[PDB]
Amino acid sequence: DEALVEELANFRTLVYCSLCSKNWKNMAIKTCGHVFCENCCKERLAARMRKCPTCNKAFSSNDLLTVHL
Amino acid sequence: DEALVEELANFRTLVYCSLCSKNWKNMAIKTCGHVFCENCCKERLAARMRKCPTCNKAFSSNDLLTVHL
Ligand SMILES: [Zn+2]
Ligand SMILES: [Zn+2]
Ligand SMILES: [Zn+2]
Ligand SMILES: [Zn+2]
């Protein structure tokens, strides 16, 4: 049933990191509340891109918080 | 198909507050990383239960962070 596939698809994108789509959300940026996987957060730090992918608010490594589920 | 229902069920419990099961996760406790809905977090504060439901680490209203997805 396709309506159930669609609901599976929406819930999946809520759970997974929106940047890689391969890892679960497990890291929040404390300055804006947006959540990604830790891998993507640190690659963005290693690339000196210190703006949030979603809302472009600025942040640093201290603003990173490990989050569960 | 039941395997798809099951996957829907697991993803749903990842997204929803585990305490009420009615609201989306949208609030993290900064002292331990566990995430609930804001409603449950504040009712627990109004009941002077200042221990995390999941890991029993202690927290207060300042340790609360609004989180998105
Ligand atoms: Zn990622
Ligand atoms: Zn943000
Ligand atoms: Zn709740
Ligand atoms: Zn906890």
Give the Cα separation of B43 and B57 in Å (integer).
17
Give the Cα separation of B32 and B59 in Å (integer).
9
| Secondary-structure percent of chain B, ordered helix, strand, coil, rounded to 5 | 40, 20, 40
Q: What are phi and psi of B58, to 5 degrees?
A: -85, 150
- Could you say which residues from 21 to 60 on chain B have a Cβ atom under 8 Å away from some Cβ of chain A? 25, 28, 30, 33-35, 54
Query: Quick count: other Cβ atoms within 10 Å of Cβ B28?
Result: 26
| Domain B1-69 of CATH type 3.30.40.10 | yes
Report the residue from A8, A28, A66 with minimal CB separation from B7.
A8
Contact B53, B19 (CB under 8 A): yes
Residue A8, by phi and psi: left (phi above 0), alpha (psi -120 to 50) or beta? alpha
Query: What resolution in Å is listed for this PDB structure?
Result: 2.3
Q: Residue A2 is which amino acid? A: E
Longest Cα separation, chain A = 45
